[PDB]
Amino acid sequence: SELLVNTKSGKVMGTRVPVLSSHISAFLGIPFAEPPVGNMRFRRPEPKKPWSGVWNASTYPNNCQQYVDEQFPGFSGSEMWNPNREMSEDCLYLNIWVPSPRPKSTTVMVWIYGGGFYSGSSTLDVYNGKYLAYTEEVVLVSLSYRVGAFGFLALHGSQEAPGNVGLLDQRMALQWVHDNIQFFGGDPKTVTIFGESAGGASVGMHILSPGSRDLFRRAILQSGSPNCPWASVSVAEGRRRAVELGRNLNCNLNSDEELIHCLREKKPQELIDVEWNVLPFDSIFRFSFVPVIDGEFFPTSLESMLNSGNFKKTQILLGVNKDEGSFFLLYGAPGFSKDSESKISREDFMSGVKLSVPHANDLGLDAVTLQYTDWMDDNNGIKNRDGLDDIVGDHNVICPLMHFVNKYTKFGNGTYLYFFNHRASNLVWPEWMGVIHGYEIEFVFGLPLVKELNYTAEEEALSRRIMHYWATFAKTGNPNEPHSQESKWPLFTTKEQKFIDLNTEPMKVHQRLRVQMCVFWNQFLPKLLNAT
Amino acid sequence: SELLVNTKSGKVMGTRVPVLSSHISAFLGIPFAEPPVGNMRFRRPEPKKPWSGVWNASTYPNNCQQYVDEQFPGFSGSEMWNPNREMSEDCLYLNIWVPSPRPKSTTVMVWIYGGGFYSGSSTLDVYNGKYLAYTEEVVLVSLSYRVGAFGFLALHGSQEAPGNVGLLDQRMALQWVHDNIQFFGGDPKTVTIFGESAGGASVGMHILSPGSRDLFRRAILQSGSPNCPWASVSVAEGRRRAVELGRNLNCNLNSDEELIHCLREKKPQELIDVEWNVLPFDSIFRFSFVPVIDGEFFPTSLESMLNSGNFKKTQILLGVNKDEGSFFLLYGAPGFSKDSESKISREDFMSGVKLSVPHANDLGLDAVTLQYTDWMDDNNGIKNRDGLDDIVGDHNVICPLMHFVNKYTKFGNGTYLYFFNHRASNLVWPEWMGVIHGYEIEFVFGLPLVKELNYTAEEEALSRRIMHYWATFAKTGNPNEPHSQESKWPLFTTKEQKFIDLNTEPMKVHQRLRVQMCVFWNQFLPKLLNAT
Numbered sequence A, B: 001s002e003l004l005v006n007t008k009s010g011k012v013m014g015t016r017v018p019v020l021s022s023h024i025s026a027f028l029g030i031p032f033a034e035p036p037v038g039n040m041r042f043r044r045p046e047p048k049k050p051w052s053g054v055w056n057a058s059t060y061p062n063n064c065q066q067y068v069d070e071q072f073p074g075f076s077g078s079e080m081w082n083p084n085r086e087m088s089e090d091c092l093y094l095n096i097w098v099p100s101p102r103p104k105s106t107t108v109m110v111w112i113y114g115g116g117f118y119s120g121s122s123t124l125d126v127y128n129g130k131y132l133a134y135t136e137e138v139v140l141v142s143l144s145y146r147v148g149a150f151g152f153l154a155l156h157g158s159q160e161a162p163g164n165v166g167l168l169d170q171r172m173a174l175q176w177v178h179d180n181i182q183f184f185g186g187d188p189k190t191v192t193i194f195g196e197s198a199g200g201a202s203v204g205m206h207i208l209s210p211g212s213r214d215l216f217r218r219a220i221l222q223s224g225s226p227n228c229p230w231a232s233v234s235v236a237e238g239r240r241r242a243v244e245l246g247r248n249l250n251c252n253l254n255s256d257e258e259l260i261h262c263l264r265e266k267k268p269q270e271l272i273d274v275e276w277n278v279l280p281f282d283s284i285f286r287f288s289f290v291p292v293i294d295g296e297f298f299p300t301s302l303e304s305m306l307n308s309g310n311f312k313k314t315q316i317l318l319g320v321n322k323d324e325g326s327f328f329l330l331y332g333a334p335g336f337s338k339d340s341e342s343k344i345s346r347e348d349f350m351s352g353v354k355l356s357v358p359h360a361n362d363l364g365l366d367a368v369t370l371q372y373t374d375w376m377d378d379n380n381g382i383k384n385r386d387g388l389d390d391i392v393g394d395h396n397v398i399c400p401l402m403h404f405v406n407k408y409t410k411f412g413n414g415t416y417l418y419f420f421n422h423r424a425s426n427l428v429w430p431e432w433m434g435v436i437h438g439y440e441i442e443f444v445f446g447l448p449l450v451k452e453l454n455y456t457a458e459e460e461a462l463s464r465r466i467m468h469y470w471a472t473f474a475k476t477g478n479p480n481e482p483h484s485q486e487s488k489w490p491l492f493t494t495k496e497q498k499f500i501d502l503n504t505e506p507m508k509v510h511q512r513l514r515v516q517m518c519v520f521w522n523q524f525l526p527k528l529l530n531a532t
């Protein structure tokens, strides 16, 4: 009864799940699209045909086909991000957590996982929706979308492999929520989309895309924004990378039709095995198959859209972590190790700069080096390590997001900006990595509320504050409860540019997040590269 | 007897002058060249024809023809730099102070006044050599040389106005010292040349020029070096500026001989009246007529000479003042005033940057602006003022000198580097100007030893320390008296790059003088300009 819901696509039967000494309802693995298999590989998604009978929605679906990390086999800190279910191209499903008893018409939050557009799953332990749904009495949805070449192979001109189909998967799931969430006790007029990393970039891309704007109310972006250097490519570069994928698999490169037909004959893992080979440079924080600026999903360049105010005008809440860069340095740059302090020699520093900014000429690499080198002390392995960490995080995450936040605030209806700088007491990664890319998510999803997970009492309190900010924002457009006597998170404005730290300490308001470095990344360096 | 000296050019009668509580011998206004007047204007100097009878050397000579500063009429802070004797093209004379009784063969120090190559006089109060000669028992010489167009009009190819004749004036005075100083009790084998501003540049130029190297033993350079951006021009630019001077004065421009013939008919003040109009830019710290890189005084470019070690290898002592820039900003940049704290608006900051780096393109100016702007606080008028002050000092004096010091020390025989950062207690210029271009000179010449000048006891001690460093370096190639127990001024080395502060506090040793900004000015910005 409470677990039996009739949707426009057919009936579903959910499951009663325990959560912090209570219970809520979960509907796991609801299909929202036709399986993008066989002749539908690389194609825009199609709506799921209605089914007869009762869909058993008591277990998580399959995860999409993706590269799996084996750098640290069995290590919890990496394995928590890997698919925990069987991989299949039959992967377009969503999950819903509903408070018990069912609300009449409550605020909806829709989670979009990150993972560089090449990886990610709705089913990770860290994305478990039950704590946030129960604690804040929201209807929490997690969608899925095709990643890698399956979601973002782009042969512009072709209707068979147009690009951005992973973004259209997200949209089709949002359309399903719009059509069906009322039957689960959600208000389709009060849907907040939120996501981290490529999920954060995606949230911003739906803000930008006209075809998406009317499918959600407001938006939260975590450590990602649509203008990130890794988050899109031109149609030309998307074409080049698709052809290089064919060449890597002895495909007929004569035409789009022959190349696509060849690529459709391959087992998914044959694509995944060569996926990294199509990148133009040795690089870190760069991903092969990402959204294309196509003229359809994106009418024009992102910069012209941002400048013109051509985007959904609403409220946004967004922010970054203190050490976004460290994970990518561990996995891809010389001298870093998870088992040492990773003091970086000057030689390794210069090597990391070139990997971190692979599109730069030598004059640009000199500019970056000078900006992040203390020439009184250039052989200090700690300053070299932290300098490189800052380079990666500033260029790839923080300054793109600050450029977005400043353009958006000129036209939007309310901006709230945060700086997450809490290092978790039980982190398994070494100290030098700081506050890592991805590690605010466990706080957003309420994991510190689980006593078995061994967070401190102050971390539980921080998680509860963060969940309440996010949910109050979703409900109202403001993370603050006015008439309350808690410290107030101020609006980010064009003039004062305020933001807060998120950590276990009493609130601090600051201004101009990393302004010095972001002037370099957002204004000076692009001018240097456009001149030379 | 003591005051009557027979030189190789004729007899000279000096005068007995009081110094503190004693006396010494002064030989003032001794001619070392034929008057460069009439058809000899712009020509290389020729040796002074010997005279019969006794030259009356009891009186300071005339000053060379030069622009006179009237910004602050009657103000001691500016008038102390203006000619204090009648100006005349008949101005190639030198002054000698001899200890009494006359020494056998003692250390010689030859002062070369600065003034941007457009101004300066051997006869200013602040250059009175009696205190140094008496206190340190050296023979102190001050020379003169033609400034402005009279010294540095350059029509390369012409033997009538070849350029660099002011530098040749200085050389001929050095040749005179070489030939005659033994008759005044000086050792011509132990001559130290020293100078400030254009005098410091000149000293470095005599180190570089083969025709100069055998006329002195070692060198001191104060707030100027031969590679400074204001200190020389190419033959094409000197020619351009010489033609433009003619155009300003309705001269025949058809040939070198016609132009020179025209310019030799003008009264000296007619040339001076338009001197500044030939500069290629609105600028500050740029001067119209300066040494040319001609292939004769300078065999090749200054950089290639420094790179290959094509220069005199000896000991050098050299340094800079904390606030080299402030004087030039006061005189030529918007927002500055001697009667206010001169807080600088952002608009005036950007104006000053363009005046300070006149040769830069827009990308270059953006680079300088970013390097010196605190973007957490860009509307702070104090920071804007101090930023502009650092830009001028770093670009024009400090970083060029650090480039010279690093290149020279690769081949030289001993380098001693100082940073003068004492603000005089009796300064008449306002506080914002700090430690001003030129204001270490009074300490080098022992003016704090005169009680009537109102220096503190500590400033007298500092002057005595500096005089002793300068004189002991001149005698031995090392400013320290070994076997003594004062703190030791260490050799600047390529590896450790040590320098000392010069102030009233006990001596501190530092390393890598303004290394962060001079990487910018010496390596990154010139690479940017050369690519753009």
Ligand SMILES: COc1cc(CNC(=O)CCCCCCCNc2c3c(nc4cc(Cl)ccc24)C[C@H]2C[C@H](C)C[C@@H]3C2)ccc1O
Binding pocket: A069, A077, A078, A081, A114, A115, A116, A119, A197, A276, A281, A282, A283, A284, A327, A331, A332, A333, A355, A429, A436, A437, A438
């Ligand atoms: C020559 O150029 C180079 C090219 C390469 C090509 N890379 C490879 O072959 C291995 C890929 C490893 C990905 C491992 C992904 C592990 N998921 C992690 C994720 C996040 N936080 C992590 C934080 C840590 Cl601490 C460890 C793993 C993390 C936050 C997310 C956001 C993500 C982007 C993924 C994901 C979800 C490598 C080095 C180079 O130099």
Ligand SMILES: COc1cc(CNC(=O)CCCCCCCNc2c3c(nc4cc(Cl)ccc24)C[C@H]2C[C@H](C)C[C@@H]3C2)ccc1O
Binding pocket: B069, B077, B078, B081, B114, B115, B116, B119, B197, B198, B276, B281, B282, B283, B284, B327, B331, B332, B333, B429, B436, B437, B438
């Ligand atoms: C917009 O810019 C422009 C501005 C103008 C108008 N200004 C001019 O023509 C020059 C006036 C300066 C002469 C003032 C000479 C006063 N001597 C001074 C000297 C020195 N220390 C000083 C320190 C102070 Cl505190 C004041 C005067 C000083 C140390 C020396 C080294 C020197 C270079 C000169 C000299 C000896 C013209 C064209 C422009 O483009």
Ligand SMILES: *[C@@H]1O[C@H](CO)[C@@H](O)[C@H](O)[C@H]1NC(C)=O
Binding pocket: A412, A413, A414, A415, A491
């Ligand atoms: C949001 O829009 C409403 C409606 O016009 C307006 O009253 C309000 O001031 C806006 N808020 C912000 C922060 O711009």
Ligand SMILES: [Cl-]
Binding pocket: A018, A019, A020, A021, A450
């Ligand atoms: Cl639980």
Ligand SMILES: [Cl-]
Binding pocket: B018, B019, B020, B450
């Ligand atoms: Cl006296």
Ligand SMILES: [Cl-]
Binding pocket: B409, B410, B492, B493, B494, B495
């Ligand atoms: Cl050395």
